[PDB]
């Protein structure tokens, strides 16, 4: 290494986002092309590693920060996010993607709080009453707009409004039936509303866009565990654990406190199975 030495605590002094070891990607020649190409033709686990490798070189890579947060959301890892997206927002506050992708990360942890502020910042680029007011905005203007029309469901989900969120997704789903993300939302509202059987089929089809969306199959496991067949949940969470990480010599594990979430489900499953 000679001079490649540390740089880790050097970039960590301000960015608390851990970089972890076992990231050989970082020095082949320039990992950006393989990192970006891995999304289309492969999984989405080592892609985050490549994004981290290209990001650690300098903090001015806006693309690296805006993509690392999005990548560390699919592979169930919504604790390594938030801070990275905030740092990306610090670099540019007019950016559209960082604000849009920062709301999906503050609603999993049930933070509420800054999620409404991020939605307002995205749109411009009682707290709830004010946020919902400005949100209406293009109630009709730019109707064919996918992002604006889909944001209504995200607004409804943070107020336990799973009734109209699915309704606006249904129009948003058919507008651009290509990306899996919009389809996953379509599933979630249904699951989170005494309606499991009406979404699982989408969970299967969503997989044909990119077989790896850990979130869809995790929700599959949750829904079937809530829908009788108490086993099966195990025979999906076990492969969830495997595909989640660990294919590159446990990825240089380090802390992996967040991963606990997944592992937890296994228990609640086994137990209800008397095991």
């Amino acid at each position: 290494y000679a001079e490649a030495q540390e740089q880790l605590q050097r970039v960590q002094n301000e960015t608390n986002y851990p970089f972890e070891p076992n990231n050989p990607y970082m020095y082949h020649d320039k990992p950006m092309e393989e990192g970006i190409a891995m999304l289309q033709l492969a999984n989405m686990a080592e892609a985050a590693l490549a994004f981290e490798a290209v990001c650690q070189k300098e903090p001015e890579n806006v693309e690296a920060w805006r993509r690392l947060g999005t990548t560390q959301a699919e592979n169930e890892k919504d604790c390594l996010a938030i801070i990275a997206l905030n740092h990306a927002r610090m670099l540019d506050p007019k950016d559209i993607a960082v604000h849009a992708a920062l709301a999906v990360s503050h609603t999993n942890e049930h933070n509420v709080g800054a999620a409404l502020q991020s939605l307002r910042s995205w749109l411009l680029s009682s707290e709830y009453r004010d946020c919902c007011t400005l949100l209406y905005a293009a109630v009709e203007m730019n109707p064919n707009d996918p992002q604006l029309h889909a944001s209504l469901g995200v607004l409804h989900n943070l107020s336990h409004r799973f009734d109209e969120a699915a309704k606006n997704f249904r129009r948003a789903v058919e507008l651009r039936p290509d990306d899996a993300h919009m389809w996953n939302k379509l599933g979630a509202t249904l699951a989170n509303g005494n309606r499991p059987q009406e979404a699982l089929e989408a969970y299967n089809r969503a997989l044909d866009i990119n077989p790896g969306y850990v979130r869809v199959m995790y929700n599959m496991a949750v829904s079937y565990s809530n829908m009788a067949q108490y086993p099966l949940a195990a025979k999906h969470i076990t492969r969830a654990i495997a595909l989640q990480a660990g294919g590159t010599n446990p990825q240089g594990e380090g802390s992996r406190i967040a991963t606990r979430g997944l592992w937890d489900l296994l228990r609640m499953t086994l137990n209800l199975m008397d095991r």
Binding site: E76, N108, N219, V222, N226
Partner: protein, 323 residues
């Protein structure tokens, strides 16, 4: 000695229960209050009472809720008894499917925050879906790795209070203190036991009416209040009495017998039922059998068992879609 913390003492089942506990709590015992809004206004109100030997502590919180509020992590140090009373009211709203989810999203956090700093502490659930929300608390406790079946109770004394009020009016040459009640806390689940009380009983044509009125009780109160609230005054009285019973048992000045809603522990299947137990220094001590049952109550008991089985299953798996 003895620290009691009411969690959510800023509503109608809040401040009133706190006031009732203030004037009956034993000398030399503190009292803690927490709520996202209105807690300082109650602390500044309960500190102007001439009761001696009682000190009041209070904490507030940010109006936008945040998981693991720092104030609770500090106030929950040294607490001996927790009364989880917060949550949305029993407002009709929409069907039960959403209210249960809303309250599950609250109990999961308000148990996780409290149990981390003070593990050995009795818990009293006085929220909504008490057939669905107690297993949620049990699951939340099991996760962190600490769980004692002898220190988790569901306050279902309101049904007993209602039951020992209608038999004292129709049959009013006599007065009886209490009547056994089994089952759970729901509409078709509560089963009064009128065959275990002294004195002759009226004809069967009236006993069934009394049992039906005991089951369908809160709906008449809701109708009497149109839609602008529910019954809170008569529910804070039962919670205060149960908390006093638990405090006396913990101190060592009584070993009372209470019914509550506790774990069966492999005795009657359906492992969350309302059966009589005896308290003690270390929580539950002995779980007593139901006793002789009239042949007309067995059908009600089996229907209640089935309904509670379904409710237990539905509540012990409240998860989330993440998204």
């Amino acid at each position: 000695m003895v620290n009691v913390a009411v969690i959510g003492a800023a509503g109608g089942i809040g401040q009133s229960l706190s006031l009732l506990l203030l004037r009956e709590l034993p000398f030399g015992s503190t009292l803690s209050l927490y709520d996202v809004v209105g807690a300082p206004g109650v602390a500044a109100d309960l500190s102007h009472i001439d009761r001696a030997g009682i000190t009041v502590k209070h904490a507030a919180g940010k109006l936008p809720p945040v998981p693991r509020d720092p104030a609770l992590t500090e106030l929950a140090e040294g607490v001996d008894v927790f009364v989880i009373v917060a949550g949305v009211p029993r407002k009709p709203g929409m069907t039960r499917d959403d209210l249960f989810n809303v309250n599950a999203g609250i109990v999961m956090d308000l148990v996780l925050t409290c149990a981390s700093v003070s593990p050995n502490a009795c818990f009293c659930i006085v929220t909504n879906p008490v057939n669905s929300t107690t297993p949620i608390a049990a699951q939340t406790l099991r996760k962190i790795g600490v769980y004692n079946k002898n220190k988790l109770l569901g306050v279902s004394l309101l049904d007993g209070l209602r039951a020992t009020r209608f038999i004292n009016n129709a049959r009013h040459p006599l007065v009886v203190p209490y009547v056994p009640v089994v089952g759970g806390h729901s509409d078709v689940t509560i089963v009064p036991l009128y065959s275990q009380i002294p004195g002759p009983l009226p004809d069967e044509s009236t006993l069934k009416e009394i049992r039906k009125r005991v089951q369908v009780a809160g709906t008449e109160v809701v109708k009497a209040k149109a839609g602008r609230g529910s019954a809170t005054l008569s529910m804070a009285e039962a919670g205060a009495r149960f908390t006093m019973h638990v405090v006396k048992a913990l101190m060592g000045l009584d070993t009372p017998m209470v019914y509550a809603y506790v774990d069966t522990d492999g005795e009657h299947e359906c492992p969350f039922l309302a059966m009589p137990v005896v308290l003690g220094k270390n929580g539950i001590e002995r779980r007593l059998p139901i006793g002789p049952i009239t042949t007309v109550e067995k059908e009600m008991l089996e229907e209640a068992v089935g309904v509670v089985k379904k409710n237990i299953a539905k509540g012990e798996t409240f998860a989330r879609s993440k998204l």
